[PDB]
Coordinates of C-alpha atoms and ligand atoms in Angstrom, one line a residue:
Chain A
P523 CA 167.0 125.4 33.2
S524 CA 163.8 125.8 31.1
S525 CA 160.2 125.8 32.0
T526 CA 157.9 122.8 32.0
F527 CA 156.1 122.5 28.7
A528 CA 153.2 120.1 28.1
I529 CA 154.7 118.9 24.8
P530 CA 151.8 117.7 22.8
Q531 CA 151.4 114.7 20.5
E532 CA 153.0 116.2 17.4
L533 CA 155.8 117.4 19.6
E534 CA 155.9 113.9 21.0
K535 CA 155.9 112.2 17.6
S536 CA 158.5 114.6 16.4
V537 CA 161.0 114.0 19.3
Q538 CA 159.9 111.2 21.7
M539 CA 158.8 108.8 19.0
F540 CA 162.2 109.7 17.6
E541 CA 163.7 108.6 20.8
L542 CA 162.3 105.2 20.1
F543 CA 163.9 105.0 16.7
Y544 CA 166.9 106.8 18.0
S545 CA 167.6 103.7 20.0
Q546 CA 167.5 102.1 16.6
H547 CA 169.8 104.8 15.2
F548 CA 172.2 104.8 18.0
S549 CA 172.4 102.0 20.4
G550 CA 175.1 103.0 22.8
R551 CA 175.3 106.7 21.7
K552 CA 173.1 108.0 24.5
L553 CA 171.0 111.0 24.8
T554 CA 171.6 114.5 26.2
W555 CA 168.3 116.2 25.9
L556 CA 167.7 119.1 23.6
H557 CA 164.1 120.2 23.0
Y558 CA 165.2 123.3 21.0
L559 CA 164.9 121.6 17.6
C560 CA 161.1 121.3 17.9
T561 CA 160.2 122.2 14.3
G562 CA 157.2 123.9 12.9
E563 CA 156.2 125.0 9.5
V564 CA 152.6 125.7 8.7
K565 CA 151.0 125.1 5.3
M566 CA 147.6 126.3 5.8
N567 CA 144.8 126.6 3.3
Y568 CA 142.7 129.0 5.2
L569 CA 142.6 131.2 2.2
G570 CA 142.7 129.8 -1.3
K571 CA 146.5 129.7 -1.3
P572 CA 148.3 127.4 1.0
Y573 CA 150.8 129.5 2.9
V574 CA 154.0 128.3 4.5
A575 CA 154.8 130.4 7.5
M576 CA 156.1 130.5 11.1
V577 CA 154.4 132.0 14.1
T578 CA 154.5 132.2 17.9
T579 CA 153.8 129.6 20.6
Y580 CA 150.8 130.9 22.6
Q581 CA 147.9 131.1 20.1
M582 CA 148.6 127.5 19.3
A583 CA 147.4 126.8 22.8
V584 CA 144.5 129.2 22.1
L585 CA 143.7 127.1 19.0
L586 CA 143.6 124.1 21.3
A587 CA 141.4 126.1 23.6
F588 CA 139.1 126.9 20.6
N589 CA 138.8 123.3 19.6
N590 CA 137.7 122.3 23.1
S591 CA 135.9 125.5 24.2
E592 CA 136.1 129.2 23.7
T593 CA 138.4 129.8 26.6
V594 CA 140.9 128.3 28.9
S595 CA 141.0 129.9 32.3
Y596 CA 144.3 130.7 33.9
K597 CA 143.5 129.2 37.2
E598 CA 143.3 125.6 36.1
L599 CA 145.6 126.4 33.2
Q600 CA 148.2 127.8 35.6
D601 CA 147.6 124.8 37.7
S602 CA 148.4 122.7 34.7
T603 CA 151.4 124.4 33.3
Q604 CA 153.7 125.4 36.2
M605 CA 156.5 127.0 34.2
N606 CA 159.8 127.5 36.0
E607 CA 159.9 131.2 36.3
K608 CA 163.6 131.9 36.1
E609 CA 163.6 133.8 32.8
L610 CA 160.2 135.3 33.4
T611 CA 161.6 138.7 34.2
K612 CA 163.1 139.0 30.7
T613 CA 160.0 137.3 29.3
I614 CA 157.7 139.8 30.9
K615 CA 159.7 142.7 29.6
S616 CA 159.6 141.2 26.1
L617 CA 155.9 140.4 26.1
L618 CA 154.9 143.8 27.5
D619 CA 157.1 145.8 25.2
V620 CA 156.1 144.0 22.1
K621 CA 152.4 144.5 22.2
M622 CA 152.3 142.8 18.8
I623 CA 150.8 139.7 20.4
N624 CA 147.0 139.5 20.5
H625 CA 146.5 138.8 24.2
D626 CA 143.7 138.9 26.7
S627 CA 145.4 141.0 29.4
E628 CA 149.0 141.5 30.3
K629 CA 149.3 142.0 34.0
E630 CA 152.4 142.0 36.1
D631 CA 152.1 138.9 38.3
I632 CA 149.5 136.7 36.8
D633 CA 147.6 136.9 33.6
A634 CA 144.1 135.9 34.6
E635 CA 143.0 134.7 31.2
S636 CA 144.9 133.1 28.4
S637 CA 142.3 132.7 25.7
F638 CA 144.1 135.0 23.2
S639 CA 142.6 136.9 20.3
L640 CA 142.5 136.3 16.6
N641 CA 145.0 137.0 13.9
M642 CA 145.2 140.8 14.4
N643 CA 148.6 141.4 12.8
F644 CA 150.5 141.2 9.6
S645 CA 154.2 141.8 9.0
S646 CA 154.6 145.5 9.7
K647 CA 153.0 148.7 10.9
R648 CA 155.0 151.0 8.7
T649 CA 157.4 150.6 5.9
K650 CA 160.2 152.9 6.8
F651 CA 160.4 151.3 10.2
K652 CA 158.1 150.4 12.9
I653 CA 158.8 147.1 11.1
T654 CA 159.7 144.9 14.1
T655 CA 157.9 141.5 14.5
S656 CA 158.2 138.1 14.9
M657 CA 159.3 138.1 18.6
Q658 CA 163.0 139.1 18.4
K659 CA 164.2 139.3 22.0
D660 CA 164.9 135.8 22.9
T661 CA 166.8 135.4 19.7
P662 CA 169.8 137.8 19.5
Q663 CA 169.6 138.8 23.1
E664 CA 170.8 135.6 24.6
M665 CA 174.5 136.5 24.1
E666 CA 173.7 140.1 24.9
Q667 CA 172.6 138.8 28.4
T668 CA 175.3 136.1 28.4
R669 CA 178.2 138.6 27.9
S670 CA 178.7 138.6 31.7
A671 CA 178.9 134.9 31.6
Chain B
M1 CA 125.0 92.0 28.9
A2 CA 128.0 93.2 30.9
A3 CA 128.5 96.4 28.9
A4 CA 126.1 98.4 31.1
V5 CA 128.5 100.1 33.5
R6 CA 131.0 100.7 30.6
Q7 CA 128.0 102.2 28.6
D8 CA 127.1 104.4 31.6
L9 CA 130.6 105.8 32.0
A10 CA 130.9 106.1 28.3
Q11 CA 127.7 108.1 28.2
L12 CA 129.2 110.3 30.9
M13 CA 132.2 110.6 28.6
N14 CA 130.0 111.3 25.5
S15 CA 129.8 115.0 26.3
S16 CA 131.7 117.0 23.7
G17 CA 131.9 120.0 26.0
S18 CA 134.9 121.7 27.6
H19 CA 137.7 120.2 29.6
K20 CA 136.0 121.7 32.6
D21 CA 132.9 119.7 31.8
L22 CA 134.5 116.3 31.4
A23 CA 137.0 117.0 34.2
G24 CA 134.4 118.1 36.7
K25 CA 132.0 115.3 35.7
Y26 CA 134.7 112.6 36.1
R27 CA 136.2 114.1 39.2
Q28 CA 132.9 114.1 41.0
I29 CA 131.2 111.0 39.5
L30 CA 134.3 108.8 39.9
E31 CA 135.3 110.1 43.2
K32 CA 131.9 108.7 44.0
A33 CA 132.3 105.5 42.0
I34 CA 136.0 104.8 42.7
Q35 CA 135.1 104.8 46.4
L36 CA 132.3 102.2 45.6
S37 CA 132.8 98.4 45.6
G38 CA 132.8 95.8 42.9
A39 CA 132.4 96.1 39.1
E40 CA 131.5 99.8 39.3
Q41 CA 134.6 100.3 41.5
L42 CA 136.9 98.6 39.0
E43 CA 135.4 100.3 36.0
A44 CA 135.6 103.7 37.8
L45 CA 139.3 103.1 38.4
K46 CA 139.7 102.2 34.8
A47 CA 137.6 105.0 33.5
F48 CA 139.3 107.7 35.6
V49 CA 142.7 106.4 34.3
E50 CA 141.3 106.4 30.8
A51 CA 139.7 109.8 31.3
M52 CA 143.2 111.1 32.3
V53 CA 144.8 110.2 29.0
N54 CA 143.9 113.2 26.9
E55 CA 145.7 116.3 25.9
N56 CA 142.5 118.3 26.0
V57 CA 142.6 117.1 29.6
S58 CA 145.9 118.9 29.7
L59 CA 148.7 117.2 31.6
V60 CA 149.1 118.6 35.1
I61 CA 145.4 118.3 35.5
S62 CA 146.0 114.6 34.7
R63 CA 149.2 114.7 36.8
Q64 CA 147.6 116.4 39.7
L65 CA 144.5 114.3 39.7
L66 CA 146.7 111.2 39.5
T67 CA 148.7 112.5 42.5
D68 CA 145.3 112.7 44.1
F69 CA 144.6 109.2 42.8
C70 CA 147.8 107.9 44.4
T71 CA 146.7 109.5 47.6
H72 CA 143.3 107.7 47.3
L73 CA 145.3 104.6 46.5
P74 CA 145.1 102.9 49.9
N75 CA 141.3 102.7 49.5
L76 CA 141.7 100.0 46.9
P77 CA 142.3 96.3 47.3
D78 CA 145.5 94.8 46.0
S79 CA 144.5 93.0 42.8
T80 CA 142.4 95.9 41.5
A81 CA 145.4 98.1 42.3
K82 CA 147.7 95.8 40.3
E83 CA 145.4 96.1 37.3
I84 CA 145.3 99.8 37.8
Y85 CA 149.1 100.0 37.8
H86 CA 149.3 97.8 34.7
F87 CA 146.8 99.9 32.6
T88 CA 148.1 103.1 34.1
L89 CA 151.6 102.2 32.9
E90 CA 149.9 101.4 29.6
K91 CA 148.7 105.0 29.5
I92 CA 151.9 106.6 30.9
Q93 CA 154.4 105.1 28.4
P94 CA 152.9 107.1 25.6
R95 CA 153.7 110.4 27.5
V96 CA 156.1 109.0 30.2
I97 CA 158.1 112.2 29.6
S98 CA 155.1 114.1 30.9
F99 CA 154.3 111.6 33.7
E100 CA 157.7 110.6 35.1
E101 CA 156.3 111.6 38.6
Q102 CA 153.4 109.2 38.0
Chain C
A1 CA 140.3 135.7 9.2
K2 CA 142.6 132.7 9.6
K3 CA 145.9 133.1 7.8
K4 CA 148.6 133.4 10.5
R5 CA 147.4 132.4 14.0
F6 CA 150.6 131.3 15.8
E7 CA 151.2 127.6 15.2
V8 CA 154.4 125.6 15.5
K9 CA 157.7 127.4 15.6
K10 CA 161.3 126.5 16.1
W11 CA 162.4 127.9 19.4
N12 CA 165.8 127.7 21.2
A13 CA 166.9 128.3 24.7
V14 CA 170.0 126.9 26.4
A15 CA 170.0 123.1 27.2
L16 CA 173.2 121.2 27.2
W17 CA 177.0 121.3 27.8
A18 CA 180.1 118.2 27.7
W19 CA 177.1 115.9 28.5
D20 CA 175.4 114.2 31.4
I21 CA 176.7 110.8 30.9
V22 CA 179.1 111.3 33.8
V23 CA 181.3 109.0 33.0
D24 CA 184.3 109.3 35.3
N25 CA 188.0 109.5 35.5
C26 CA 188.9 106.2 37.3
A27 CA 188.7 107.9 40.6
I28 CA 191.1 105.9 42.8
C29 CA 193.9 107.8 41.3
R30 CA 192.5 110.3 38.8
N31 CA 194.6 111.0 35.7
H32 CA 192.0 112.3 33.2
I33 CA 189.8 109.8 31.4
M34 CA 191.3 110.7 28.0
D35 CA 194.9 110.8 29.4
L36 CA 197.3 107.9 29.3
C37 CA 198.2 107.3 32.9
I38 CA 201.4 105.9 34.5
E39 CA 199.8 102.4 34.7
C40 CA 199.2 102.6 30.9
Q41 CA 202.8 103.7 30.1
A42 CA 204.6 100.4 30.6
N43 CA 201.4 99.1 29.0
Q44 CA 200.8 101.8 26.4
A45 CA 197.4 100.8 25.1
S46 CA 195.5 102.7 22.5
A47 CA 193.3 104.4 25.0
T48 CA 189.9 106.0 24.5
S49 CA 188.9 109.6 25.4
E50 CA 186.8 108.0 28.1
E51 CA 189.5 105.3 28.9
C52 CA 192.3 106.5 31.1
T53 CA 192.7 102.9 32.3
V54 CA 189.2 101.5 32.1
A55 CA 187.9 98.0 31.4
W56 CA 184.3 97.7 32.5
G57 CA 183.7 94.2 31.3
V58 CA 183.5 91.1 33.5
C59 CA 186.7 92.6 35.2
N60 CA 184.4 95.6 35.6
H61 CA 186.4 97.5 38.1
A62 CA 189.5 98.5 36.2
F63 CA 191.3 101.7 37.1
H64 CA 194.9 102.6 37.3
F65 CA 196.3 99.1 37.9
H66 CA 198.5 99.3 41.0
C67 CA 196.6 102.2 42.5
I68 CA 193.2 100.5 42.3
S69 CA 195.2 97.4 43.4
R70 CA 196.5 99.2 46.4
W71 CA 192.9 100.1 47.2
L72 CA 192.3 96.3 46.7
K73 CA 195.1 94.7 48.7
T74 CA 194.4 96.0 52.2
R75 CA 190.8 94.8 51.9
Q76 CA 189.6 92.9 48.9
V77 CA 186.3 94.7 48.5
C78 CA 187.3 97.5 46.1
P79 CA 183.9 99.3 45.9
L80 CA 184.0 102.1 43.3
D81 CA 182.8 99.9 40.5
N82 CA 182.7 97.1 43.2
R83 CA 184.9 94.2 42.0
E84 CA 188.5 93.1 42.2
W85 CA 191.0 95.6 40.8
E86 CA 192.7 95.6 37.5
Chain D
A204 CA 183.0 88.3 51.1
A205 CA 185.0 87.1 54.1
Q206 CA 186.7 90.5 54.6
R207 CA 183.3 92.2 53.8
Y208 CA 181.3 90.2 56.4
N209 CA 184.1 90.1 59.1
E210 CA 185.0 93.8 59.1
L211 CA 181.2 94.6 59.1
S212 CA 181.0 92.3 62.1
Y213 CA 183.8 94.2 63.9
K214 CA 182.2 97.7 63.5
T215 CA 180.0 98.8 66.5
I216 CA 177.5 101.2 64.9
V217 CA 175.3 98.3 63.6
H218 CA 172.8 96.3 65.7
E219 CA 174.3 93.5 67.6
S220 CA 172.2 90.7 65.9
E221 CA 173.4 92.2 62.6
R222 CA 177.0 92.2 63.8
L223 CA 176.8 88.5 64.7
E224 CA 174.9 88.0 61.4
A225 CA 177.8 89.4 59.5
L226 CA 180.1 87.3 61.8
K227 CA 178.2 84.1 61.0
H228 CA 178.4 84.9 57.3
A229 CA 182.1 85.5 57.7
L230 CA 182.1 81.9 59.2
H231 CA 180.2 80.8 56.1
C232 CA 183.0 82.4 54.1
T233 CA 185.5 80.6 56.3
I234 CA 184.2 77.1 55.7
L235 CA 182.7 77.3 52.2
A236 CA 186.0 77.9 50.5
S237 CA 189.4 76.6 51.4
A238 CA 191.9 79.0 52.8
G239 CA 193.8 81.5 50.8
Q240 CA 196.5 83.2 52.7
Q241 CA 194.9 86.6 53.6
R242 CA 191.7 84.5 53.8
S243 CA 193.3 82.3 56.4
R244 CA 194.6 85.4 58.2
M245 CA 191.0 86.6 58.4
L246 CA 189.9 83.1 59.5
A247 CA 192.4 83.1 62.4
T248 CA 191.2 86.6 63.2
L249 CA 187.7 85.0 63.4
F250 CA 189.3 82.3 65.6
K251 CA 190.1 85.0 68.2
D252 CA 186.5 85.9 68.6
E253 CA 184.5 84.8 71.6
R254 CA 181.4 85.6 69.6
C255 CA 182.6 83.1 67.1
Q256 CA 182.8 80.7 70.0
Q257 CA 179.2 81.7 70.5
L258 CA 178.6 80.5 66.9
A259 CA 177.6 77.0 66.0
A260 CA 180.6 76.1 63.8
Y261 CA 183.5 77.1 66.1
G262 CA 184.6 73.5 66.1
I263 CA 184.8 73.7 62.3
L264 CA 186.9 76.8 62.6
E265 CA 188.8 75.0 65.3
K266 CA 189.7 72.2 62.9
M267 CA 190.6 74.8 60.3
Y268 CA 192.9 76.4 62.9
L269 CA 194.5 73.2 64.0
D270 CA 195.2 72.3 60.3
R271 CA 193.0 69.3 60.4
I272 CA 191.9 67.1 57.5
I273 CA 188.1 67.3 57.7
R274 CA 186.4 64.0 58.1
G275 CA 182.8 63.3 57.1
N276 CA 181.4 63.9 60.6
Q277 CA 182.0 67.6 61.1
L278 CA 181.5 67.9 57.3
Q279 CA 177.9 66.7 57.8
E280 CA 177.7 68.8 60.9
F281 CA 178.3 72.1 59.1
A282 CA 176.4 70.7 56.1
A283 CA 173.4 70.7 58.5
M284 CA 174.5 74.3 59.2
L285 CA 174.3 75.6 55.6
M286 CA 171.7 77.4 53.7
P287 CA 170.4 75.4 50.7
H288 CA 171.7 77.8 48.1
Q289 CA 175.1 77.4 49.7
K290 CA 174.5 73.6 49.3
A291 CA 174.9 74.0 45.5
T292 CA 176.3 71.0 43.6
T293 CA 176.2 72.7 40.2
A294 CA 177.6 69.8 38.1
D295 CA 181.0 70.1 39.6
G296 CA 180.9 66.6 41.3
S297 CA 180.9 67.3 45.0
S298 CA 179.8 70.8 46.1
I299 CA 181.8 74.1 46.2
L300 CA 181.9 73.5 49.9
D301 CA 182.9 69.9 49.4
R302 CA 185.4 70.5 46.6
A303 CA 186.9 73.2 48.8
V304 CA 186.9 70.7 51.7
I305 CA 189.0 68.4 49.5
Ligands
ZN1 ZN1 200.2 110.5 30.3
ZN2 ZN1 199.4 99.8 36.3
ZN3 ZN1 189.2 105.3 31.4

């Protein structure tokens, strides 16, 4: 089971709209839902040279927060999201350990505010090591966890 | 002209402020005006349904206030409720994935 | 300023499998829905991986012929797909 | 449908009006078609019911039981006892009832 995600319009148009045409593609080859392919590549001309890159999930919401206001408070926000918190223990461990993410405040039970900071980080701290970022844990760890299974 | 009530609720929508602004304004003003009678009742039903279409009005605010709207549902006559369910289906089927409960 | 501020990624957790079209095994007697049954041995039809002995057309309630028919003969309402038995 | 309605009329968990409702629809399924063999077995099982003697068309089931050629009189009797969708003459000449009477 995964959490409940809002899935915005671009996410909608990527997948759901696809579901429309998918009926056109396959009529009779039905759907088993898989969100995982939500794709994202950013070509941004913030600075003279369009850059194609990939980044994390939260600040996008922050960007949305910025368009509307400066902040999105966690109370209403939490009211809106309601993630299924099965995985949350592992998630919390990862978010706390990383500290690469520009966040408002990482508390144990509830993070009171999710109106995250600006682009604080670049690829690495050091060159020998102390290298590690994008957020790795979900990625190789799944089998690591799954071994029992 | 008949565009007066639509113009008033459109002026109450013309605020480019936060989601808290538009959401609080339409929660209070259309909890007032939905529970009225007549053309302002009908247009408040339509304008609350149309106010809960956004993604800036993020979805379980829309879902929760539409659960609240489905609890306010017996305050309404039947034909206005019919048109509510028509236009509300018309807003759901864009994001019916998000509003399967609705 | 604004060069990498966390917009759309590919992200994967575990979803599926095996799928959730059910689709079920002709349950009156339940040789596997790929498997050629006894009732399709004297018949020996080219049978689909979801067709043990299944014809859901107008006949619509078609399981293992004499076993679905034995569930048919003692009372003619054979209710799993709810029609007469093939 | 005859076995459906009859053995729903014999069960005792259901309301009594609903038992005799299933029973009278089993009598509808008696008269509307002509007798197949297990059908006729269920019709004679219906003939052993005092509640069917409480029904309006027990004389029709009686003439079914006594192997009687149905004349127009009791024909029109149970034709007064039908529902109008069960009175369907869908371009078959005489009705499904009446062709089965023949
Ligand atoms: Zn076999
Ligand atoms: Zn067979
Ligand atoms: Zn099969």
